[PDB]
Symmetry: C2
Subunit: 78 residues, 2 copies
Amino acid sequence: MNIQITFTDSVRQGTSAKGNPYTFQEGFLHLEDKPHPLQCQFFVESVIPAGSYQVPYRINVNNGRPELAFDFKAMKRA
Amino acid sequence: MNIQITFTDSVRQGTSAKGNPYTFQEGFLHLEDKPHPLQCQFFVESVIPAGSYQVPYRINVNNGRPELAFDFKAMKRA
């Protein structure tokens, strides 16, 4: 399972209410059921260079809630 | 895109801090990359009868965050 994600050079950096550091990066999402891409932000560890990628994702369950886990280690530049 | 979800008769009902009502139902998730199923809860509108289903999901973006949207209207009993 993978999806095309067009990243940008827009990265929101800052500290959370808990004093913890976070790095949110912007990126556009492409859905087979959507004609236009959606602007989304990702909680990346390292800044990703702007460009379209085919990221292999999986459905992980955290604290009992189903969430998406994107594998940036196996993403393919589109 | 679909995934096997084994629902149960465990539904957590209650009010949120905002006084709003919520209906959380239990269900087991099946991942191709996992040998055993994971216990997960869903924010359903109506109680679903315990049983394994093949639910067609999609990746929706809310408030700029990528999340899963399960289509219980097109799920197939497994």
